[PDB]
Enzyme design. Sequence first.
Site, PDB file in Angstrom:
ATOM      1  N   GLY A  14       0.883  -1.404  -0.470  1.00  0.00           N
ATOM      2  CA  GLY A  14       0.034  -0.680  -0.470  1.00  0.00           C
ATOM      3  C   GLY A  14       0.734   1.444   0.085  1.00  0.00           C
ATOM      4  N   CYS A  15       0.133   2.206   0.298  1.00  0.00           N
ATOM      5  CA  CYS A  15       1.131   3.467   0.741  1.00  0.00           C
ATOM      6  C   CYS A  15       2.218   3.011   0.962  1.00  0.00           C
ATOM      7  CB  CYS A  15      -0.139   4.468   1.500  1.00  0.00           C
ATOM      8  SG  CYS A  15       0.319   6.064   2.087  1.00  0.00           S
ATOM      9  N   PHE A  16       3.650   3.846   0.452  1.00  0.00           N
ATOM     10  CA  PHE A  16       4.533   3.437   1.105  1.00  0.00           C
ATOM     11  C   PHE A  16       4.729   4.435   2.305  1.00  0.00           C
ATOM     12  CE2 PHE A  16       7.058   4.980  -3.139  1.00  0.00           C
ATOM     13  CZ  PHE A  16       6.344   6.284  -2.962  1.00  0.00           C
TER      14      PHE A  16
END
EC number: 1.8.4.11
Length: 168
Positions: A14-16
């Site tokens: 997901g969102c890093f």
Amino acid sequence: RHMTSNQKAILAGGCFWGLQDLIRNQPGVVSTRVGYSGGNIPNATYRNHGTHAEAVEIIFDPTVTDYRTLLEFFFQIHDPTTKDRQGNDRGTSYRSAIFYFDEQQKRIALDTIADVEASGLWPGKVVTEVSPAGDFWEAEPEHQDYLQRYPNGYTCHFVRPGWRLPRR
């Protein structure tokens, strides 16, 4: 060069920003950086990364932690059961993936997924990709260490204490 040389992993979940912020503080993690990996095009950026996933490259000390332990934590901090989405982040950018550097990592990854599935503790089928590691395009400076620098920034990653295997 030696048996306990630092080892490397590339994980996507997901969102890093959130993935880096949680992994960076794990025991035995020497260094992390975020970037784009698993896709097609070279010289990938935030605006232009094609089929790459947002990913975290992790350098770790194998006498302090190990690949299995890092994967268990990975499966504890992102939901691995949603295809091409993490929380409200939708698209292939946000897919769950383990990009392995060698056959042992591949085997450990698959073994870990088998144990996760058998536990029944996660919400559904594990859809995590297990694929050989390729190019890792380092993200722009503004995306590095984002939640360290801006601790009230967006995240949807968190530890699920119940997403835990008591034994392997």
